[PDB]
Design a protein around this motif. Structure first.
Motif, short mmCIF file in Angstrom:
data_model
loop_
_atom_site.label_atom_id
_atom_site.label_comp_id
_atom_site.label_asym_id
_atom_site.label_seq_id
_atom_site.Cartn_x
_atom_site.Cartn_y
_atom_site.Cartn_z
N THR A 83 4.86 -31.92 -14.93
CA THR A 83 4.03 -32.75 -13.75
C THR A 83 3.69 -34.13 -14.76
N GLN A 84 3.67 -35.02 -13.93
CA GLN A 84 3.39 -36.30 -14.70
C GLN A 84 2.19 -35.75 -15.19
N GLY A 85 2.32 -37.44 -15.92
CA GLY A 85 0.74 -37.91 -16.92
C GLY A 85 -0.47 -37.87 -15.84
N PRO A 86 -1.30 -37.25 -16.12
CA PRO A 86 -2.85 -37.35 -15.19
C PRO A 86 -3.41 -38.59 -15.10
N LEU A 87 -3.39 -38.76 -13.76
CA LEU A 87 -4.08 -40.72 -13.51
C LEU A 87 -5.11 -40.80 -13.17
N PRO A 88 -6.05 -42.13 -13.48
CA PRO A 88 -7.35 -42.26 -13.97
C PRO A 88 -8.32 -40.95 -12.82
N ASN A 89 -7.58 -40.92 -11.15
CA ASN A 89 -8.02 -40.18 -10.43
C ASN A 89 -7.95 -38.86 -10.45
N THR A 90 -6.75 -38.16 -10.99
CA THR A 90 -6.06 -36.74 -10.66
C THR A 90 -6.33 -36.34 -11.88
N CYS A 91 -7.16 -36.38 -12.52
CA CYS A 91 -7.43 -35.19 -14.07
C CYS A 91 -8.42 -34.66 -13.43
N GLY A 92 -8.97 -34.38 -12.49
CA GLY A 92 -9.69 -32.92 -11.83
C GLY A 92 -8.66 -32.45 -11.74
N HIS A 93 -7.92 -32.52 -10.49
CA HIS A 93 -6.69 -31.99 -10.05
C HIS A 93 -6.07 -31.32 -11.25
N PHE A 94 -5.57 -31.96 -12.26
CA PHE A 94 -4.77 -31.19 -13.46
C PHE A 94 -5.44 -30.03 -13.97
N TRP A 95 -6.50 -30.53 -14.62
CA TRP A 95 -7.20 -29.26 -14.86
C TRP A 95 -7.55 -27.95 -13.86
N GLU A 96 -7.83 -28.84 -11.78
CA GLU A 96 -7.74 -27.54 -11.67
C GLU A 96 -6.68 -26.62 -11.24
N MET A 97 -5.56 -27.25 -12.16
CA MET A 97 -4.46 -26.52 -11.73
C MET A 97 -4.25 -25.77 -12.48
N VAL A 98 -4.12 -26.26 -13.74
CA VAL A 98 -3.81 -25.06 -14.83
C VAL A 98 -5.53 -24.27 -14.71
N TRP A 99 -5.81 -24.01 -14.56
CA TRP A 99 -6.95 -23.02 -13.94
C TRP A 99 -6.71 -22.03 -13.10
N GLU A 100 -6.54 -22.71 -11.74
CA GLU A 100 -6.18 -22.07 -10.47
C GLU A 100 -4.66 -21.32 -10.90
N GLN A 101 -3.89 -22.11 -11.56
CA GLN A 101 -2.50 -21.05 -11.93
C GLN A 101 -2.10 -20.49 -13.91
N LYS A 102 -3.48 -19.92 -13.52
CA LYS A 102 -4.14 -19.27 -15.00
C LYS A 102 -2.98 -19.34 -16.04
N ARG A 155 -4.57 -28.40 -30.07
CA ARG A 155 -6.26 -28.64 -29.34
C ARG A 155 -6.42 -27.93 -29.10
N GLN A 156 -7.81 -27.09 -29.60
CA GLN A 156 -7.74 -25.85 -28.55
C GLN A 156 -9.44 -26.49 -27.87
N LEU A 157 -8.70 -26.23 -26.70
CA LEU A 157 -9.57 -26.49 -25.44
C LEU A 157 -10.40 -25.63 -25.32
N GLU A 158 -11.77 -25.63 -24.54
CA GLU A 158 -12.19 -24.69 -23.48
C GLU A 158 -12.91 -24.86 -22.41
N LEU A 159 -11.98 -24.94 -21.41
CA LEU A 159 -11.66 -24.83 -19.85
C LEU A 159 -12.47 -23.54 -19.49
N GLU A 160 -13.74 -24.41 -18.57
CA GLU A 160 -15.33 -23.73 -17.71
C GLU A 160 -15.05 -23.74 -16.35
N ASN A 161 -14.91 -22.71 -15.32
CA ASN A 161 -15.78 -22.60 -14.27
C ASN A 161 -16.64 -23.26 -13.47
N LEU A 162 -17.79 -24.23 -13.75
CA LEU A 162 -19.56 -24.21 -13.91
C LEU A 162 -19.09 -23.71 -11.89
N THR A 163 -17.89 -23.25 -11.53
CA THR A 163 -18.75 -22.27 -9.88
C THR A 163 -19.15 -21.48 -10.46
N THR A 164 -18.28 -20.54 -11.39
CA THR A 164 -18.20 -19.31 -11.37
C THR A 164 -18.62 -18.86 -12.58
#
Length: 281
Positions: A83-102, A155-164
């Motif tokens: 993927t391309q480096g996240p843009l100012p406005n696509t950081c949420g998408h970037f992480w959404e992907m990481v999350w959905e693609q497991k 870096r160890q990061l924690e990703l949380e799905n605020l929805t679930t």
């Protein structure tokens, strides 16, 4: 071994020529979705688009676009999402992907700023007390630990799905020492970085595809994936010398365009694979 071919290309100084033939032979598929007007602000470079057949689709009924391609290496039994480096406005998408693609790991091969310019947004938190929240994709990211070494940082990061309210730990491998111009002088550091990632288990099959990015997500990102796969192949095939970098690169370019942007990065890949073949064998 391919090292012979290597030394001969060097003797002939025909790299640019070997590299060009690769570009000519490279696959060319449509990028319809990527070029639609609504997704204009979602792309970093005009000339770096994901093929439609292999693009990653966000699980949004709304807009499912994100400049990212899934590279599926059948024989190596390895997959990567470039993927391309996240843009100012696509950081949420970037992480959404990481999350959905497991995905378990994210590999960054550039610094936020290179050559006095921003190569990508600061998409992760720098201090653990200041978590980040992406309201559009409803995700929370928290810095848990950061280990700074000489040529890379983990870096160890924690990703949380605020929805679930479900939580996952993403390992972020950042290669901080790639020079502003050209390629590394020695593949030594790169190979260690690669091995560190492998060790984390981020590349293993039980997890989704490792997300790999640079600025355009093809140059250094190509090098990473190409070296990894070629090493895996030499590692499982009866005759290791049968692994052809050039054939593998073209197999990869069927999934994302432009991987390896210079005849100079090509050489370096050859280099990395060879030295890495020796550290393994």
């Amino acid at each position: 071994e391919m090292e012979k071919e290597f030394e001969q290309i060097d003797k002939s100084g025909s790299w640019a020529a070997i590299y060009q033939d690769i570009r000519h032979e490279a696959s060319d598929f449509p990028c319809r979705v990527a070029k639609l007007p609504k997704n204009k602000n979602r792309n970093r470079y005009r000339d770096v688009s994901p093929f439609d057949h292999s693009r990653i689709k966000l699980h949004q009924e709304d807009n499912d676009y994100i400049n990212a391609s899934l590279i599926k290496m059948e024989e190596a039994q390895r997959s990567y999402i470039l993927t391309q480096g996240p843009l100012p406005n696509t950081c949420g998408h970037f992480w959404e992907m990481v999350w959905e693609q497991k995905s378990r790991g994210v590999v960054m091969l550039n610094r936020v700023m290179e050559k006095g310019s921003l190569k990508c947004a600061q998409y992760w938190p720098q201090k653990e007390e200041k978590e980040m929240i992406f309201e559009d994709t409803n995700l929370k990211l928290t810095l848990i630990s950061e280990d700074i070494k000489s040529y890379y940082t983990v870096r160890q990061l924690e990703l949380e799905n605020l929805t679930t309210q479900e939580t996952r730990e993403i390992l972020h491998f950042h290669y901080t020492t790639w020079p502003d111009f050209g390629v590394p002088e020695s593949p030594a550091s790169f190979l260690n970085f690669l091995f560190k990632v492998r060790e984390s288990g981020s590349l293993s099959p039980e997890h989704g595809p490792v997300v790999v990015h640079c600025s355009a997500g093809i140059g250094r990102s190509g090098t990473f994936c190409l070296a990894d796969t070629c090493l895996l192949l030499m590692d499982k095939r009866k005759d290791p010398s049968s692994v052809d970098i050039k054939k593998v690169l073209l197999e990869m370019r069927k999934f994302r365009m432009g991987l390896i942007q210079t005849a100079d990065q090509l050489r370096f890949s050859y280099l990395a694979v060879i030295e890495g073949a020796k550290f393994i064998m």
